[PDB]
Design an enzyme around this catalytic site. Structure first.
Site, PDB file in Angstrom:
ATOM      1  N   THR A 229      -2.257   2.113  -8.223  1.00  0.00           N
ATOM      2  CA  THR A 229      -3.250   2.938  -8.544  1.00  0.00           C
ATOM      3  C   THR A 229      -2.508   4.065  -9.828  1.00  0.00           C
ATOM      4  OG1 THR A 229      -2.910   4.883  -6.975  1.00  0.00           O
ATOM      5  CG2 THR A 229      -4.250   3.111  -6.650  1.00  0.00           C
TER       6      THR A 229
ATOM      7  N   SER B 267      -5.573   6.822   0.035  1.00  0.00           N
ATOM      8  CA  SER B 267      -5.680   5.427  -0.199  1.00  0.00           C
ATOM      9  C   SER B 267      -6.945   4.970  -0.877  1.00  0.00           C
ATOM     10  CB  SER B 267      -5.730   4.986   1.168  1.00  0.00           C
ATOM     11  OG  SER B 267      -4.650   5.043   1.794  1.00  0.00           O
ATOM     12  N   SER B 268      -7.133   3.991  -1.923  1.00  0.00           N
ATOM     13  CA  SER B 268      -8.102   3.429  -2.633  1.00  0.00           C
ATOM     14  C   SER B 268      -8.784   2.578  -1.323  1.00  0.00           C
ATOM     15  CB  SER B 268      -7.622   2.752  -3.800  1.00  0.00           C
ATOM     16  OG  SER B 268      -8.912   2.252  -4.569  1.00  0.00           O
TER      17      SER B 268
ATOM     18  N   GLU C  63      -1.793  -4.055   3.965  1.00  0.00           N
ATOM     19  CA  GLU C  63      -1.556  -2.944   4.978  1.00  0.00           C
ATOM     20  C   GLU C  63      -1.550  -3.638   6.171  1.00  0.00           C
ATOM     21  OE1 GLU C  63      -0.647  -0.707   6.770  1.00  0.00           O
ATOM     22  OE2 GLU C  63      -2.577   0.088   7.368  1.00  0.00           O
TER      23      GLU C  63
ATOM     24  N   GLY D 287      -3.581  -2.702  -1.589  1.00  0.00           N
ATOM     25  CA  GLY D 287      -2.631  -3.694  -1.114  1.00  0.00           C
ATOM     26  C   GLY D 287      -2.544  -4.064   0.310  1.00  0.00           C
TER      27      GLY D 287
ATOM     28  N   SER E 255       0.827  -1.176  -0.099  1.00  0.00           N
ATOM     29  CA  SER E 255       0.087   0.061  -0.101  1.00  0.00           C
ATOM     30  C   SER E 255       0.903   1.278  -0.003  1.00  0.00           C
ATOM     31  CB  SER E 255      -0.780  -0.032   1.071  1.00  0.00           C
ATOM     32  OG  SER E 255      -1.696  -0.980   1.401  1.00  0.00           O
ATOM     33  N   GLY E 256       0.741   2.137  -1.145  1.00  0.00           N
ATOM     34  CA  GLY E 256       1.459   3.284  -1.166  1.00  0.00           C
ATOM     35  C   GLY E 256       2.725   3.138  -2.242  1.00  0.00           C
TER      36      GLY E 256
ATOM     37  N   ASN F 185      -1.175   6.098   3.075  1.00  0.00           N
ATOM     38  CA  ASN F 185      -1.523   6.691   1.643  1.00  0.00           C
ATOM     39  C   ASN F 185      -2.386   7.971   1.869  1.00  0.00           C
ATOM     40  OD1 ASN F 185      -1.295   3.551   0.015  1.00  0.00           O
ATOM     41  ND2 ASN F 185      -0.196   5.577  -0.022  1.00  0.00           N
TER      42      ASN F 185
END
Lengths: 151, 136, 772
Positions: free
Chosen positions: C172, C210-211, C428, C426, C167-168, C207
């Protein structure tokens, strides 16, 4: 050959005169000189033999000039095949088209770029025209550019 | 119309109205107007015509003078060839520079003789008006 | 090639290098250190650290073979002599600190997050990557996309990119650049992101954007190989962020956009005071977001609703329903010492809500304080059904929103094949992890295992199928387990799912029923360990996920999985005035969505993108070797490269090969199978790095990336040569003009000298005189 070297001579004058007649030419023009004797080297090409990015930088005699042209001769020239190949990689349709906008992008944005002026230039010269959808047959264009200013 | 004048001219020049031009004919009319040429001038001035000067050998030598020249359009263009912006005028310093030391360099006299007439006003030398003046 | 367009894209290397002295020795800070051996002693080797020049000993079997300067910043790592955690980490980190963030690892790509904007995505650059073969031009994401296109076309089959990472990392950003790319070689498509991201993204510690939902977007193509449509699928949106947000985190982006004053005109339409720190539901954690202008994002989001083709009512229906939420949480309450059922504590805010949703504020608070056979609710049973409602609305809005944006994209045009892109949320690990995370994590697992299957399990299978020759190799990469611990028949979720159906159940019968089944019967399931980060909230058990060990707190997992909104209010809204408002367990449902996604994926020729987070500080150009190295481990990079070098994972149908690599020896091409026999022959290609085939060519690992290199190079030259040709044409065209002016001057010079000498002719003089 002689009739050849004579030709280098002929042109060397027209130039050496315009940047002040004195039997010397600004190394920044060595490109255009040879571009007149038919050849079309690439900027990468020219600098390799002696060309310069700016005027004033330096001037050259006809003595040093002979080999710059001997040089820019043995360098690769693009065939019709090659120009056709590369242009195909931008055609999703596959039917010999492209849009003005994109063609513009290829010329101005990719490879040894081309000023925005030289572009509107050659467009107008070759009198290239788009249809209603704003597309152009890149096959025609390549043929003209290849043709010459006087066909 | 170049002829119509020639004749009417030959008429005023041919004083003794005898259909011929003689040393006295020339000398005659010149003086009636402006200073006239000296004997030597008048002599070789006629020797320029094989035989008697009827209105024929006249138009002959005059036509053989004005022969070997181009158009008012052909010249007005050789000019606009330095008039990028298409303004129908050349900047005086420019033209003078061209003629003076470029191509078949002129000379100061050629230079003075040429500009003594030239129509330059506002820095710009109008090559149209001057192409006419030099032509028709 | 001298092309400015390659500043942060093309690699910019000799001496002091003894292949027997120099090696890689383990490190605690850098993961691996450059060492030079000094003295052996059985197993105790004594090396010198080149950096600080310190000294130390190291087991002999812990030294790693370093690669020669020959492979500095190599574009394709499968071409390196040594592919070990220290050679890989060194190559990446080498490139990265130089601007290069893309590198091929054999058949798939590696993207290392730049944390800064790079001029490598321009239209200038896209022009150069078009139709280029991976080895022909520098490594780039465009190349991965451009190639999947060529394959779908020539091979006539669906393509697909699974862009993975932590994540991050860049999942994306890279997914968008792929679409933006494929779109450029349309306007609404690109424009669907701004609205979906506003409603399904949020600041998080990890993030700032963050999605919070899974995204699978397919891009359809027509009979001329052009974009002819597109659809979007989303998965598991964080219903929970709506009403709750851990410290240092924000709620979805919209809510903050809505209270900025980007469009004052709207303030009265939504009935909002431009202050976010005013609404409980969105001021719990963070308010602002370093590098996110809510003002401008709101404008652009509004702007994007227009381009998407949203009627003004439609897009005001959205904005209102979401601003309505900002109120559901303002409705205060009270009891009334006695029975407590509960009474209101005003009605001002509870009306604005009924108003915006087009229902009677009366009938509302009514079916909310004594849901109907009646059954009153206490003071919390209410405040919690309020949240149940907020969450459930937002989950419908988001779903309707997507259906609508697909309305605008499902052009009924003619479709051939497509190229999907998968961006799922993803891995996290936070201070406190609950059901939400298990869901995201279970999701991300899953995916990794896909790569493991298609990469190792798979490769060898095909070898068998075709009936070639080979001996198996166990890369020991399987998570079926972890996967199994969570999804299989008696798994974690299945236990929870069967625990919801019981009204009796609670956070303890669930917790006990869990150990009851997996404690000691599955080693992935382990009692909560000890803190590895401060503020580490409660943990009831730990799971050993591919990319980390996660301590999960199962408190509240029963309600979280069984949703619950007053079937009463669902009646109110069922017949509301607003037209929008009017229009199985979670686990089972999602498990099913996911299984269906996976099923859709398998029917593909996958190209993989691997994202990598450089550090835990969110700052650009800074590397944390340990972390990096660590990823280069749980992702299977090295192994992912061994087979590319070991077996031969590439494969190309001569038909699609000739079309893409003819431009590499055209002075030797007068049958697709012989043409290639020629091209690859011309290039004086090593018989080693490739193989025959009846219908297809097999190139050892990395080689194809390198052919796309040479492919570009040529494509750039040729483009220059045609520009040279254009330069030479324009020059020669203006030659008369220096030719033209040479004539135009001779006219004037010779024709003035005439008029000059004619005036010096006695005859003419006298003539001119008579004139009048």
């Amino acid at each position: 050959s002689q009739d050849e070297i004579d030709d280098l001579k002929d042109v060397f004058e027209l130039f050496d005169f315009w940047d002040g007649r004195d039997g010397a030419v600004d190394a920044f023009k060595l490109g255009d000189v040879c571009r007149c004797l038919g050849i079309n080297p690439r900027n990468e090409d020219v600098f390799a033999v002696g060309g310069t990015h700016k005027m004033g930088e330096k001037s050259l005699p006809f003595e040093e000039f002979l080999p710059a042209y001997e040089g820019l001769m043995d360098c690769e020239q693009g065939t019709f095949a090659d120009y056709m190949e590369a242009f195909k990689t931008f055609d999703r349709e596959g039917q010999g088209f492209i849009s003005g906008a994109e063609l513009r992008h290829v010329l101005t944005a990719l490879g040894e770029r081309l000023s925005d002026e030289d572009v509107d230039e050659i467009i107008k010269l070759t009198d290239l025209q788009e249809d209603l959808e704003g597309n152009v047959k890149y096959e025609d264009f390549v043929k003209k550019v290849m043709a010459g200013p006087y066909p | 119309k170049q002829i119509q004048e020639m004749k009417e001219a030959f008429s005023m020049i041919d004083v003794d109205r005898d259909g011929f031009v003689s040393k006295e004919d020339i000398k005659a009319i010149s003086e009636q107007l402006g200073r006239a040429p000296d004997d030597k001038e008048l002599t070789a001035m006629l020797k320029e015509a094989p035989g008697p000067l009827n209105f024929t050998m006249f138009l002959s030598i005059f036509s053989d003078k004005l022969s070997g020249t181009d158009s008012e359009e052909t010249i007005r263009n050789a000019f606009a060839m330095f008039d990028e912006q298409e303004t129908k005028k050349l900047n005086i310093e420019y033209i003078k520079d061209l003629l003076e030391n470029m191509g078949d360099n002129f000379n100061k006299d050629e230079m003075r003789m040429t500009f003594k007439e030239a129509p330059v006003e506002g820095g710009k030398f109008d090559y149209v008006k001057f192409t006419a003046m030099i032509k028709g | 090639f001298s092309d400015p367009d390659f500043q942060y894209l093309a690699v910019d290397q000799t001496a002091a290098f003894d292949g027997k002295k120099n090696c890689w020795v383990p490190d605690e800070k850098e993961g691996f250190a450059s060492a030079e051996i000094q003295s052996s002693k059985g197993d105790e080797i004594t090396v010198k650290i080149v950096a600080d020049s310190s000294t130390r000993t190291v087991k002999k079997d812990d030294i790693q073979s370093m690669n020669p300067p020959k492979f500095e910043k190599l574009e394709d790592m499968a071409n390196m002599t040594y592919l070990n955690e220290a050679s890989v980490l060194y190559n990446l980190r080498s490139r990265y600190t130089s601007g290069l963030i893309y590198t091929y690892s054999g058949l798939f790509c590696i993207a290392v997050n730049p944390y800064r904007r790079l001029p490598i995505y321009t239209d200038s650059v896209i022009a150069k990557y078009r139709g280029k073969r991976k080895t022909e031009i520098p490594p780039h994401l465009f190349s991965v996309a451009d190639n999947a296109y060529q394959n779908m076309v020539t091979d006539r089959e669906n393509q697909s990119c699974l862009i993975t990472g932590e994540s991050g990392a860049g999942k994306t950003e890279n997914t968008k650049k792929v679409i933006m790319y494929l779109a450029k070689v349309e306007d609404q498509i690109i424009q669907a992101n701004p609205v979906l991201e506003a409603y399904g993204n949020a600041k998080t510690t990890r993030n700032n954007n963050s999605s919070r939902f899974g995204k699978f977007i397919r891009i359809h193509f027509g009979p001329t190989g052009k974009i002819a449509g597109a659809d979007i699928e989303t998965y598991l949106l964080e219903k929970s962020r709506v009403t709750y947000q851990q410290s240092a985190e924000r709620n979805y982006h919209i809510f903050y956009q809505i209270c900025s004053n980007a469009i004052p005109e709207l303030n009265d339409v939504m009935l909002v005071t431009p202050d976010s720190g005013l609404y409980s539901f969105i001021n719990q954690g963070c308010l602002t977001v370093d590098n996110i202008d809510d003002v401008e994002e709101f404008k652009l989001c509004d702007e994007a609703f227009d381009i998407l083709g949203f009627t003004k009512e439609e897009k005001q229906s959205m904005f209102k329903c979401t601003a309505s939420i900002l109120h559901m949480g303002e409705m205060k309450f009270k009891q009334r010492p006695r029975e407590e059922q509960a009474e209101s504590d005003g009605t001002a805010e509870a009306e604005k809500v009924a108003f915006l949703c087009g229902i009677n504020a009366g009938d509302l608070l009514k079916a909310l304080l004594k849901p109907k056979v009646t059954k009153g609710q206490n003071m919390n049973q209410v405040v919690n059904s309020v949240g149940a409602l907020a969450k459930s609305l937002y989950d419908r809005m988001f779903n309707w929103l997507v259906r609508r944006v697909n309305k605008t994209l499902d052009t009924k045009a003619k479709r051939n094949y497509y190229i999907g892109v998968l961006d799922i949320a993803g891995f996290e690990i936070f201070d406190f992890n609950s059901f939400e995370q298990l869901c995201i994590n279970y999701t991300n697992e899953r995916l990794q295992q896909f790569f493991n299957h298609h990469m190792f399990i798979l490769e060898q299978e095909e070898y068998k199928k075709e009936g070639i020759a080979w001996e198996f190799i166990d890369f020991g990469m399987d998570l079926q387990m972890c996967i199994d611990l969570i999804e299989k028949p008696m798994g974690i979720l299945s236990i929870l799912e069967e625990e919801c159906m019981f009204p009796k159940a609670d956070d303890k019968s669930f917790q006990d029923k869990l150990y009851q089944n997996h404690m000691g019967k599955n080693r992935m399931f382990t009692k909560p360990g000890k803190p590895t980060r401060p503020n580490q909230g409660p943990a009831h058990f730990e799971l050993h996920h591919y990319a980390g060990n996660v301590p999960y707190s199962i408190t509240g997992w029963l309600e979280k999985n069984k949703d619950p909104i007053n079937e009463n209010v669902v009646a109110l809204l069922g017949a509301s005035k607003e037209p929008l408002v009017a229009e199985q367990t979670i686990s089972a449902v999602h498990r099913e969505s996911l299984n269906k996604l996976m099923k859709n994926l398998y029917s593909t020729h996958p190209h993989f993108v691997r994202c990598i987070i450089p550090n835990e500080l969110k700052q650009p150009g800074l590397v944390d070797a340990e972390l990096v190295l660590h990823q280069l481990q749980c992702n299977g990079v090295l192994e992912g490269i061994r087979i590319c070098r070991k077996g031969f994972p590439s494969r190309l149908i001569y038909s699609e090969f000739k079309q893409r690599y003819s431009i590499l020896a055209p002075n030797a091409i007068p049958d697709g199978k012989t043409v290639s026999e020629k091209i690859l022959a011309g290039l004086q290609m090593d018989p080693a790095e490739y193989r025959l085939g009846t219908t297809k060519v097999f190139f050892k690992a990395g080689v194809l990336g390198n052919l796309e290199e040479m492919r570009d190079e040529r494509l750039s030259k040729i483009i220059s040569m045609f520009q040279a040709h254009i330069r030479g044409y324009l020059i020669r065209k203006a030659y008369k003009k220096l030719q033209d002016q040479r004539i135009g001057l001779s006219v004037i010079q010779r024709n003035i000298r005439k008029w000059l000498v004619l005036r010096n002719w006695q005859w003419w003089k006298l003539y001119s005189k008579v004139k009048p």
